[PDB]
Design a protein around this ligand. Structure first.
Ligand SMILES: COc1cccc(CNc2ccc(S(=O)(=O)Nc3nc4ccccc4s3)cc2)c1O
Ligand SMILES: COc1cccc(CNc2ccc(S(=O)(=O)Nc3nc4ccccc4s3)cc2)c1O
Ligand SMILES: COc1cccc(CNc2ccc(S(=O)(=O)Nc3nc4ccccc4s3)cc2)c1O
Ligand SMILES: CCCCC/C=C\C/C=C\C/C=C\C/C=C\CCCC(=O)O
Ligand SMILES: CCCCC/C=C\C/C=C\C/C=C\C/C=C\CCCC(=O)O
Ligand SMILES: [Fe+2]
Ligand SMILES: [Fe+2]
Lengths: 662, 662, 74
């Protein structure tokens, strides 16, 4: 009758010394009440040997009440494990939550359970009560119309406590914000007594917030090879697509018959690629400190040479208009300053579409919709919730901090970036209309963009490998808990979660290929693979490259302070320098790039969450197989990268964070 | 053949993601090599299920090698527990150390073991090797001649890494130093545009660094009752002693026949007490910023009324000299300003003797001698080492920080305190000559001082209760591991530790009653009870009252800026105010009082160390009985204190830190 | 000064007042100096509370000094 109760504590803030807890061991045949004296230690759980006279049977719940606690005392309980009298099996009760208030917190038994039709079942009652509690604390908010809905939190303090940053993450985030502000102030003081008239003057600020790859970028940004390489394996690999036909906007003037012949030859050869930034057309540009920024919607046509390297054929900086039916077509054979300015405009547009569409919307906002819907509709007992909860860690707070500080009206995005000041919200709406289910799934996105089988598309290879590994993990968990298709259909909480993402969170995403329901195990598996890839791998691909490719500001301008060139002979070094961002906007670009792309000291690698929501050995085995496949993929990526002058490192699983946290 | 290895990690700093460890399970019949991937979590240990083909037998050692680690990566391993194939007993291997370098770290089996005469025994070889390693990293240093020896560390960075502050303690200590510096700067700015001519002007600085008891002290410091009460239950309860005879220095002039009759009546009644500050006689006073400080060696005679309250009879501020054969005898019936100045001089002298003799020397330096000798002569296998190691935590670094920052030449003690500037080192030498073994043991110290059985001596009652409880803990551990007297005598490491404290650390303390050897279990029990009380309870008594009694600077001046009065009629408010410290020294007194007496957020209550050095159930039971007695004593002290206008709270076991850390 | 209120002396500023109604030297100097002293003490209190939490009633002890009385302490 000796029950050993081990309380793993994730975090605590105990002002006093007597922090007591009333704990109930609720079993099938009875419950037992205990009084425990919490004295948590770092790295060690607390044991509590207690003799229970009554026969509790199989334990189903652990109930917690904080007994006469101070108001400032906080307790994040990781989990409670109970060893029976002679059972010797540590029955797990995962909590992973802040125990607040004087109310009883019920922790169900750690075996993941689907909802049933037995209303009298204790787990069914607990999951219904839990779902009501979650649907009252986790509410949807419309941040902007036409956008996917957010968590109902005006500020980070309005968030639910379980979605908050833990101490180490919050301290690191705020300290690195102060460090970036300090370094930017030092850079701006440094450039007060220096001229800003040549590209080498960007060396005056190119320090502290940079990488070795960023130094290589500073050495090689003017090369057309690196400019073309950025479309495949740069910060934004999400836009370039193979051309099945010449674009309609690509209007060639007279005398471009050689370029037309080359474009037709690349088209019939199947080596013609395009990056169309047409989503930026008609987007109002920012006005920063009374200075008008400028935006363009370029089209750049690339050719794939036999050596696996892309080469630029033509840049059209502006789409055709009634005012300008035939835009100037910039070529690599042009005067070098005009071609360099055209490449800088294309990379600036890539910066806009990368940060707004493919970083903020496709990864951050989609993961926040997944996070809110997972908390609202999937109870703690649900296997899909236990599967998804490590991959939605810190997503709500990082999106709330973005909405309050970065992308607010007057935020940091309105201080450096050309799409800011309201145009970025319209661009977010336009990209939300383009935010399809097909675009978020690498096999379908890369088949649609024609990037399958490309030897130099390192992102594409790594993303397909990550998708099949993550899909193996997903199908292992789902086939563990959903044996048949009718079991998937018969799960009301899962269907409610699917509707919450599609109908509610993504704002009627039926037309955009998102499912309203799951009719089979495979459909649920594909959707959850999309969720995990968006929360972990897509964000790592679209986020880790910010410092590598954006610390050198001329390689990817955050804004343009001059109108796009319409003639090639009129472009000088003064035109390029006035078109490039000033030192304040460039330093802000560098600081945000560093802050967002740096490795978090408390980061969790993909699949290596320490929180044990699942209790059974079979989901643990599926997770272990997932980790083994990730280490094998990391070995393959390292072996490939060591033989490359330009390694792709953003999709290494150790460097892929387990959720969207930054 | 499935060995489950659980690695509890106290702390880590992992820059990268692949921190591998080669672990050897060394048993009586063989050893097994493993490769473990460390991914530590807060509050949770790391499990590692591994199949061992060979029969290891009973496990004796766990060997650790860091396998290709980064230079900045650090790992403080708490302990390693191994569960056998079907044994089900978690064989513990406590480490509680920073794993540094590429060398193999051998962790013995957690059962405490005495040294044997079998040289071929693996534990004997390990403990000899460990003792050599410890005697090379833990060396004695002579900070000042005539003083007890210190750890060989010129700065805190020169300390052994296992004696360093952990992250939370170091951050809290440095942040509270910056906070105290900020608050003092604000107080000094505040007093620039205010007059300093009355006692109420000390209200201008009496904020932020104070307590409710300190406010009561500000309300009642001029009362003779509180002044007398401070000798029994104030910050310094270590000096007042019952008078068996009238002191020789108490020279009464003519006309003091009534005072002589009262002193004789109190002497024959047995209610005559004295606080003789004669140790301060001839001590050179500080010179702070060109202003000469002044020191006195007073004698104050107290009478115990039937209601249990002490009352002051006479204050002699200066001892008799050839120049002044009959010093002025200040009485409570004098002009009030002269009597108030005499009481302020007595309390200033109490501040000097409290901080130098009874805080720095009797508690901090003695615990540092115990700490260094324990590390040098007692191996990790030794039961007395496992007993003492929680009670020597942070002692070396707090003494090193004191020696480098506070009490150095030009340190903070030379900036506010009258004994500073070199005189405090001479006072430390004089108190070291008075530092007897009898003085550090409450039953003997209170019997010698005649404070036994006093109803109002709350410190004395709490100290005797703490001594008997701690002695029960000590005798439980010792009788668990030392069954006979010849076992105590036959332990060479214990005798070496005794010599290291007495002959080496305390600099030939034979004449001062410290033992050169242990001839019985009871002698070792009494000495270890002295060690634990000095490290925990004596320091708590002499340290927690600093803010309560010293935030109001006129209640206990850190320095005196005028010579002591020789006449009663010439003392004015100007004389008192010029005698009291200026705002800079008073603010420094307040800041140090707050910094030293505040509850550390990471503090370990007495007997509640989470580190499990002992593996057996019987030392755990002895520790549990110790904790139970401490909670019963805390309930008794709280029940006594709730009915008292002046509660004594410094010896509550929850408020007693487990070691000298501040 | 305001409609519906009792009427005031016709003086937009203190300098527009009749000279016989003006503060004498000691009163004016004391009033202005105590305004500067209160501004100084408030600046010091606000600097003090920058690095302190404001979540309990005892945090009002962080500012309860300098401008108080014994009755205010009670
Ligand atoms: C991790 O590093 C960071 C990245 C992004 C933003 C910050 C900090 N917030 C910020 C906002 C606006 C600007 S800003 O130049 O647009 N305005 C300024 N106003 C003032 C006001 C007074 C004195 C100087 C200045 S600079 C700069 C930084 C970082 O620390
Ligand atoms: C927990 O709080 C504390 C307790 C004790 C000491 C410190 C800080 N060290 C310190 C040393 C000397 C002095 S001191 O007034 O003797 N000198 C000064 N020099 C300068 C130099 C420049 C500007 C101002 C000053 S005040 C004060 C503090 C604390 O933060
Ligand atoms: C006898 O003592 C006083 C009582 C009442 C008012 C004053 C002084 N006038 C005042 C007005 C407004 C504020 S206020 O915090 O509302 N604004 C601030 N603006 C700035 C501007 C720059 C720098 C700091 C500040 S604080 C505070 C005082 C006293 O000295
Ligand atoms: C890195 C290039 C410059 C800005 C890019 C624009 C938008 C970022 C994309 C998604 C937004 C998500 C999270 C931002 C994180 C935290 C807000 C704090 C302020 C900051 O982080 O500043
Ligand atoms: C509290 C009254 C004024 C000073 C008293 C004198 C000496 C203290 C007694 C023992 C010394 C031990 C530890 C001091 C701790 C740390 C040094 C940091 C500086 C400081 O802590 O300042
Ligand atoms: Fe991000
Ligand atoms: Fe101390």
């Amino acid at each position: 009758g000796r029950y050993r109760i081990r309380v793993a504590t994730g975090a605590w803030l105990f002002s006093g010394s007597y922090n007591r807890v009333q704990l109930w061991l609720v079993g099938t045949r009875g419950e037992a009440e205990l009084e425990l004296q919490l004295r948590p230690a770092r790295g060690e759980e607390e044991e509590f040997d207690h003799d229970v006279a009554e026969d509790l049977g199989l334990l189903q719940f652990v109930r917690l009440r904080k007994h006469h606690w101070l108001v400032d005392d906080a307790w994040f309980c990781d989990r409670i494990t109970v060893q029976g009298p002679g059972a010797c099996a540590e029955v797990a009760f995962p909590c992973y939550r802040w125990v607040q208030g004087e109310d009883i917190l019920s922790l169900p038994e750690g075996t993941a359970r689907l909802p049933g039709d037995n209303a009298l079942d204790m787990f069914q009652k607990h999951r219904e009560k839990e779902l009501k509690d979650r649907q009252q604390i986790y509410c949807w908010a419309t941040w902007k119309e036409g956008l996917p809905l957010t968590i109902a939190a005006d500020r980070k303090d309005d968030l639910p406590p379980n979605m908050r940053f833990h101490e180490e993450k919050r301290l690191d985030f705020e300290w690195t914000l102060k460090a970036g502000a300090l370094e930017m102030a030092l850079k701006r003081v440094y450039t007060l007594l220096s001229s800003w008239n040549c590209l080498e003057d960007f060396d005056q600020i190119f320090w502290g917030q940079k990488s070795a790859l960023a130094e290589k970028v500073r050495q090689c940004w003017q090369d057309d090879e690196l400019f073309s390489y950025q479309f495949l394996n740069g910060a934004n690999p999400m836009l370039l697509r193979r051309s099945t036909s010449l674009p309609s906007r690509l209007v060639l003037p007279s005398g471009m018959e050689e370029l037309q012949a080359q474009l037709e030859k690349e088209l019939q050869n199947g080596s013609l690629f395009e990056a169309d930034f047409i989503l930026l057309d008609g987007i109002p540009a920012n006005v920063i400190r009374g200075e008008k920024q400028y935006l363009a919607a370029p089209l750049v046509m690339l050719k794939m040479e036999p050596n696996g390297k892309l080469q630029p054929m033509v840049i059209q900086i502006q789409p055709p208009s009634p005012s300008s039916p035939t835009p100037t077509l910039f070529l690599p054979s042009d005067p070098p300053l005009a071609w360099l300015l055209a490449k800088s405009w294309v990379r600036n547009s890539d910066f806009q579409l990368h940060e707004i569409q493919y970083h903020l919307l496709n990864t951050h906002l989609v993961a926040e919709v997944i996070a809110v819907a997972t908390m609202r509709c999937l109870p703690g007992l649900h296997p899909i919730f236990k599967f998804l909860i490590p991959h939605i860690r810190y997503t709500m707070e990082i999106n709330t901090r973005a909405r309050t500080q970065l992308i607010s009206d007057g935020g940091i995005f309105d201080k450096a970036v050309s799409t800011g000041g309201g145009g970025h919200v319209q661009l977010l709406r336009r990209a939300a209309a383009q935010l399809t289910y097909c675009s978020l799934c690498p096999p379908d996105d890369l088949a649609d963009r024609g990037l399958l089988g490309l030897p130099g598309a390192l992102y594409a290879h790594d993303a397909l490998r990550l998708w099949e590994i993550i899909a193996r993990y997903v199908e292992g968990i789902v086939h563990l808990f959903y044996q048949r298709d009718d079991i998937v259909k018969g799960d009301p909480e899962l269907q409610a979660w699917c509707r919450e993402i599609t109908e509610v969170g993504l704002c009627q995403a039926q037309d955009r290929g998102f499912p309203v329901s799951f009719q089979s195990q495979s459909q649920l598996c594909h959707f959850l693979t999309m969720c995990v890839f968006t929360c972990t791998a897509q964000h790592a691909a679209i986020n880790q490259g910010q410092l590598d490719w954006y610390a050198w500001v001329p390689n990817a301008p955050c804004t343009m302070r001059m109108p796009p060139p319409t003639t090639k002979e009129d472009v000088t070094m003064a035109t390029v320098m006035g078109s490039l961002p000033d030192v304040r906007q460039a330093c802000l670009q560098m600081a945000i790039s560093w802050h967002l792309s740096r490795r978090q000291p408390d980061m969790v690698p993909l699949g290596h969450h320490k929180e044990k929501y699942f209790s059974g050995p079979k989901p643990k085995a599926v997770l272990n197989q997932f980790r083994t496949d990730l280490e094998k993929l990391e070995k393959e990526i390292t072996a490939r990268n060591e033989q490359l002058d330009w390694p792709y490192e953003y999709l290494k699983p150790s460097c892929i964070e387990n959720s969207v946290t930054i």
